[model samples]
Target: RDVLEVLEFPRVRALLAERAKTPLGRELALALAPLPREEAEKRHELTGEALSYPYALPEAGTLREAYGRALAGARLSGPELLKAAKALEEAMALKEELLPLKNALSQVAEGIGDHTPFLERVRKALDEEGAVKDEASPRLAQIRRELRPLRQQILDRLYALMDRHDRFVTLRRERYCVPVRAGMAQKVPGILLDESESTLFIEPFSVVKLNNRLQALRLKEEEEVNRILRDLSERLAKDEGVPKTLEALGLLDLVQAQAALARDLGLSRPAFGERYELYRAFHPLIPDAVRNSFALDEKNRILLISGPNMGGKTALLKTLGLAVLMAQSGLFVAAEKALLAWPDRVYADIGENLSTFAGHLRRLREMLEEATSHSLVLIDELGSGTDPEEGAALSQAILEALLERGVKGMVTTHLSPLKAFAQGREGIQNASMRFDLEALRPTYELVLGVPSYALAIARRLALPEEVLKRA
Candidate 1:
């Protein structure tokens, strides 16, 4: 159904998204939806390709801002630059990784761009910590080399003057200064930088000229760093490969997650058949749920399931629909085996909540309008929410209309009249969820070719012979 909550499909997404290795992958898992047959087939094939020759995805990290800044003529920080590099690196690695493949998964490798040159440039400019390296620019390196000697010359003189007493060199406002006794403040031939209760911090006249040169070099070094950052950012903008690589990585992230779920759920590949069939199928969202065999083949296009209240008829209905939904989403079905047709759309009226017969009737009318042979319909309590006699009659008419279009799906109901309606229909079948009166609970097992009957209940309670007799 369009509103997947009724089927607990969102819960399944939650479970699947938890296995995602990347943020984008987790988002993809959450956004997963049913695909048309052609696209779904490719995804199914891609997932199968992962079962063997699997590739553990490398961390691509966040590159969106990096790419965005580059396009907007802004620069990326060291961190963003490194993240971009890692993102591209992973894509290139995957490109090589898929080289041996010749399947749907490999076909997508074409979407990845050649990002080697872009990554190489990033590595040359930024170190592993994402800080601009000294070697990033010849000027940045040379300025630093010159600044190093100047720094040593200042520290040497200041320390020699420890031969300069308890005075030590420190930077106050980016200028090197010496802290001298306040009594010697006037004696020190330098500029006063700072003063405390008993000490004066002075930039000695000896190192002032050199310190001035040092501050100039510091300015030049920062300018060089900015230039290098912009150069790298520009490279990111020019290399269309980066964006393509981002998309390709996100796609692989999703595909790998799907593969992971297949393993986690113990799922099997589904094949197309005349109608849906699941062997030992159970609802994936139900923990320790019972498995049941179900079918809607050429022989029985509509299967009407009847049983006592709380006999899990709705559970059975949902199991079949969920299997189809998962299958169409390119994820494997939770079953020992599965075969299904690609329903163009699934129509469901599982609203015991609507509790209004008219609600059921309106939806059925709309369903009859668009339903086709390829559509699947699921009706919970098909002849319920109204007077039994009229409900049974009206529901039968709707079922007949769906049959006229050759629609295939499951229906759950407790209506004896509707159950009776199926026995004589060539393309319909009656099935029931078994109930154990002795245990006063439902076995939750589906029984084929049998409708829920009162005779068994009467016998179990040992009804009187005369009362059991016909009226």
Candidate 2:
């Protein structure tokens, strides 16, 4: 129970409550918890690159939602929404096609017959009456008795057809039309009258009843089908639980996102956030550098980083910025805890800040204003994006302003004047991302309190001897 509180944040708690029914959110939260507090802290820092708080918060509840919809996008897979919609459409179509059949089945026409009484009357006249049987005066009665058999046969066939339709419709729970033959086939069993042809015909065996019977069956079937579809719709629409299918998809997405975040923040080490402050912290992006050399350290607050063009000053600055961001984002940092200060806010002006849609100066000014109070400020190429003289002045003023506000600022620059300027200030020092002169290559090892040398690169390039000796 006292292992670690990896996912301890008020915002995260709120997110969990809001997305309680979302499968992806549940899995993401679970994955984040109990995974060693140190590792989580590192991941938090790296994952911050994708967090809404760091840049733009995703409208969706989880990281998958954020990545799945970066902006305007067409998902590679087909739209599932359309499939669910089509299911509802099919259920509706069947409901409209069969209503008459159900009504007839329910109203079983047992007493609605004129032929049954006629047949009975004819039978009575011909039965055990010698006077009527032999007399020429009873010719009309004889004619009625002779035609009675045919009428009775037709009536029996009609009732049989209706019964068949009713049974089939009830059993199958589907709409169907029963075929009845009526015409020349009247001599056959189950023959029906063909009103259009004024004849009789044999009816084909089928589930759907002919005429009234068939209509009644379909009606009953359609009603039941409609009820079932509506019930399914109602059950699916409830928000009490997350659909099993969505949760499965969400699980995979969150796992992949978490793994990627760990890799980015250099989580391969056992003590992920506890390896900095030996000499210079390992490059979060380029972890291979740490494995091959001495560990970095931070005995002092300010680090003076110096190196050649190919040497890794910019890389070091980025690595530090990323590591800090990761820590605040609630992931394990890429350095020892001692080298880190868990600042309330991380303010970074790395990479390109120039933008057309959002004013660059306004953004810079906004950042400066915010960083003036208890924040960690990281500036890459301090004041080097614009005019040189003006840039130098701005750099000095900015550095001074950050120092005045008790803000911890880390800046990487090639300006000799700025390095000198750092020496004069209290709570400020100089460091360098080290480059070896004799080896004529960057060691990728950062060392504090050192002036950088470019003679190795010039000599390697075979520059004129006079260029090497300005004196």
Candidate 3:
């Protein structure tokens, strides 16, 4: 399981993947695991580099798979070698680019620069086009020189033979040494390579026994090419530093992607401590979402939010939970500023389900069993799936039990009794969404007080005048 396996996490990952610039970055973003406090601190520094860098970082992706193939004694193709070498080159280049900013980005710059020396050697082993360099080995260079002449000599002999037999051949392509007429195949004293649709003979025959020597040379050249490829692969497999370099670059890409996403979304870094506060926070997934501020602490372990339906109560619950999640994951929050204590774990129960009253009770019971002082619990419409009177009773009991255990969380509900009961309770705070009474609309603003106007809101929602009058 990756970090934050909640339902809303996939949307965050999808946004991260969309922001990543490379395939490896996308892969890392998708597989993001939870970072311990120390590691998250390190990530913050690299993200700082991304914001301060004058030029864009080099485009890079992991070459671990390519290097792994070589380590497994597999012969890499031209394209494969090229990709690996280029990835290493880019890694080295990024390190060089970050050197001058060493003091400001100490750990980040040092981590990237440490791989530079090793990657430079690997980059030098391959030419610009991904071919093994002549300087890579003297023997490989000599073989290549011999290959060109041998190749030319073979083609020369084939063309000479074909020119001599122009009259006996109706048509002749470079590789297809075809004879002109049918049944004239025997007239050429050479091996038949293939036959044309018109019964013409395609052979590589030489009248002077030059064919055998030419074929022998061409075979030798193929062997030499294979030998060079194998040598390069073996040498690369021996370098343990290559895989380390790949990992470093992959991590850097993830940091850059996080920074880019934060910049685009106008997210801010969070301050961690014993207190929890957010200013003008909103949900990233909501368009034109209203921003609101909320605070929680030892004095207010839980915010008992009560408000009219469709007044952004549910959105606030999700937004607050996600803000902590993003901060703990080393990503920025969807707010102007946030300072909060990092929770050991975050849990949410916010969806509409077809569960029976007993089922809802059972699930809530399980969630409560897992709660601790460090847990962040978010439940929408607590004790909902039961008879209204009994539901309010159960809701108050649950809230009291949570406070007794010293657990921190937020619960939204329409239980008027629960709202009134929390008004003067110690370590439990009553909160509400400010309603626009005249306009009959929700301001979507959170306020520290009680709201006892559920039916009043319904009246303004255009319910029948008869029902209002009767009530």
Candidate 4:
């Protein structure tokens, strides 16, 4: 049910995600679902809160992963604990940062509620950088205290041994033991752990004795830390509001990204209704793209654009389609002003394939099979690949069908009959890409009620005199 597969919207989606501050936000932006008007409006309002104030979301890489693992009952490692702690601390910081503005964005924050107390409790369970705090629990504190003297005792023994030997004993961090000269192992009196390539040897016997006690203390310390973290993680997991809060934050991130785009491009928010009026509309992805104005309403629901080759009709069609897509998706449009209703669906066939006139017309018929009045259709060079008379007749008939179906659309064609057909139609209008006869170049400007002269443009291109004369 994604609309991106059919058009240039994938580019716009990528641009939107590029502006997101967090992984969650980027993920959400990539998968943004098309919602009903009420839901879209709600999201629109939530994003506006970010525009009203400054905000910063926690780093996404660590925080959410830790929480997710903890919730799944997986034991967290040392790094995971640290990451979880840092995330919680940042969450509390954010609470304080946004509390003053809470009243200002009361409605936006209503579903989120006050998460400060729980965040503060989680912060107390760990230190600033995510280590288990000594004061976190009585049992944890006792184990740490017991480990302190044992740690000192191990270091004290190592230092004494080093002083006696004085041959540059190296602490082997990997084995948690020290290496002394091979000749000194007998004097060292411990288990042989390893020997260096240079013949230095490590003994674990006495050091192992101290380290064994220390290892037990360390294990006990680890167990206590795990217990505290497990408790905090469980508390967080059980909170029903955590998911909702994260969703809101992700939404805020997305909205802020949208606002950033609007600010940078000077885009405008669109009003939703039954009509479409795009003033000074330009394609954001195009460099020096011509800005054009157009409108369609109940009175004139379809615009038939006529032009010579390379007259910018296809680009204009894409521009309007993208603008509508951006507007309904709750992003700003690249226009001075835009007002439009969200179409149930948008169908476009604006590329050059005049050689397959019959096939193109057949595909257009298939496209319109289930088309409703709420659909927006864009067709380029409609009925141009076949016999001129048949093409004009077919183009005229299709436009008539679209008009009768109450669909809103734009079609490009050079068939004189279709141009004439639009003249007396109740809900169809004729428009053309302006051509400068003297310069023999299209201005790419859309002007109403004019038919573009293709022969004049062909002559200006210096076609052979005999070819021109024959035509």
Candidate 5:
């Protein structure tokens, strides 16, 4: 519906997304629009359940790619494995914590299954920094055990032989080396690994056999680590329950953000009613906004508002529309107390760097044909953008037709004639934005059963006697 953008509900969605801890929840929030009555009520319950728990949700970053990679039979790297481990661990924890509540979150966790076996095995394989521990496998531990003594013996032999070039003992290209200057490059019996300005990094001949032994053992250690990593990856891939665990985490992430936004914004949970009845209502985007209480019922189905230009007319219309939009999207409305009838859809012809007079008429035609008692129609400057005589004629007829359909909405117009027509009609209610003629200022308050006195301003302008008489 055009109501969402005109009411700037998309911007409100962005505010909700800001509290999300991960991309999963942010994307979910961005995709949100108004839902049907049944689904929205369910969503509201979920958000309420989230607020019942005081603890924040644990971190579960986007692991969709890692899960996909494992399913495709690829061995994960150490860091990748660690990330997967943490995400699943958190998912399990959430499922366990929420299980006793038997609320909406428990329903979301129905698909999540136990991941203890995989967690246990992966925990043993990976260390704190996601590096493969020496104890990952017995063969790996044994290879590393031999590698330690072999490395010590090589370093000891190099120390014994390096009486002359001992100052530059360094490790280079996976082998122990010493930097030999240009003058001593040929004098040193060694294999030169690399060269710089005036020096050579050379692995000396004294420990060549020992270095070769260490290199072979290191390769064996690497192969064993690969085998262990592959085993864990396969275990995760073959499991049928991990995908459901991810789904549970994504939904919980979104709900927690919703709950947090509800707490921060000070909104109210709305009950479905026969009409929009909001108490102390204010614009959601405005700061220090004036709060007003208003309602619509069978007697006054369409509220016809009239006032001087820029007298908070459109702001009032949007406050109603936004309250309806919010409650329909499973979120709280921005009011002290609100009870909204779920609209079939919301329609409006608001000018927002948007709409032409002809375009407005086209939308008016669209609204008249489709709107039912359940629809909300918010129109600005009705019968405007055309000549006044015909505009007032049509505006009065439109109000009569809207009442005939029992449609509920807020309409604002400057046409003077419709104010009397609305007064004579039963279903249409006359309202005005209070204007102080003496000060030529708008008080921005809604007053019922009154017509604005824009004529008093023209009289105050000191128009000639004939012009005043022409009115």
Candidate 6:
């Protein structure tokens, strides 16, 4: 596991290619055989849980219970179960009869042969025929004969118990002899098995001990295997400094998958150290529909995006924010080529409309409180739910406040003051959605340093020209 961890981090793709010969890498590849890379990356957070070995997750409990219920749905007659139960009970009795001899043998195996001086002497005498003096020879022969009978008797009883256990397991599987426990139905129906304070409960379709015993046997086998391996490892180290292991060269497919995703989303790679220049940036969800694009210098400055109704300002902001999320999640961006700086925390207040309540000022303050603290922020239509003059002033104040905190953000708005203000600032850059005046429709392409839309889309969609003229 330690070896596998070392192979996964920093650059897992490089590690797989370079350290293919290590036992850890070989073992990890074997373990990961059942998992596909795309599926694994999709749930990378869940992949971390599999690091310690694939135990059933919390969600798997229901599936397990459902299996039990399915088994119980095929149960045989009660008389057959009763007969098997009786046989099991008899088998237990027979094993109990041999307990004393079994215990004696167990004690001998636990305490004597590996380390006892007496056993060593006995072994030596046996190996050398009649090397021991007169009295020892007859006594040793008697001890050996007596031990053999005791061992055979214990083995016979144990074999009987094992046969009984096997018969029970076979019958349960074939005839669906699973006992119905009351809470089993609840679990199968995708509900928790609500065990009461009272210990007695009947769950439908539960094989009470078979599954539990099987699990116990599996755990015991694993423990024994690990113990043997640990001893073997020690011996190998002493004899030959551990055996060198190797594996075949594998690819780092995650990078290619990310690159494909970026291409799919029309993301252009930003240059190194210039984090803001995402050329042809498009929203993951609405790239074709919105179709906005822009660029900026690497000074962690603000990009004030403004546009008319139905023009794609909100989509632009959302595209930027989601792109950042995808990049950090080890995904390719929705641009031509993307080089992203991992933000400490990217804050977004893009789609929030505080219009249901009248306290727009309070909501603005709350948003500013969080946006000011973020290293990167995405703000959409800041302060738009209030009087236009005051709203634009408040938006300007908040933008200035965010700048004072040295935070990088892109604010999307429809106000002329915001566009003019950003165009004149040191830390602010103007951006807008391009519209065709002759066609009276949004082209959906973005233009930097230009604010170009004023109910032109409403008119194109056939709004009354009289109303537009009045405004």
| Candidate 5 lDDT by residue in tens digits, 186-220 | 76788988887636888888778888887888888
lDDT of 1 by residue, 210-296 (tens): 899989889999999999998888888899776667677777877777888889877877887667888998877777889899788
Please write out the lDDT profile of model 2 over residues 45-159, one tens digit for every residue.
3343323221111112332332233222423121221233222232223222222334321122111112223223323422243122222224434444444453344344444
Candidate with the greatest lDDT versus the true structure:
1
Judge candidate 2 against the unseen true structure and give its global Cα lDDT, from 0 to 1. 0.43
List TM-scores for all candidates, in order.
Answer: 0.91, 0.48, 0.83, 0.85, 0.90, 0.43
Put down candidate 3 lDDT per residue, 279-325, tens digits, no spaces: 99998878788888888888889888875554888889888888888
What is each predicted model's overall lDDT from 0 to 1? 0.80, 0.43, 0.70, 0.72, 0.79, 0.45
- Measured with C-alpha atoms, the lDDT of residue 75 in candidate 4 is 64
Candidate 6, residue 86: how far the Cα is off, in Å: 40
How many pairs collide in each candidate, listed in order?
1, 53, 2, 1, 0, 18
Ten-residue region with minimum lDDT total, candidate 1: 159-168
TM-score of 5: 0.90
Model 1, residue pairs in steric clash:
161-164
Worst 10 residues of 5 by lDDT: 54-63
Local error of candidate 4 at 325, Å?
Answer: 2.0
Candidate 2 clashes: the total is 53
Which of candidates 1 and 5 reaches a greater lDDT?
A: 1
Model 2: worst 10 consecutive residues (lDDT sum) = 104-113
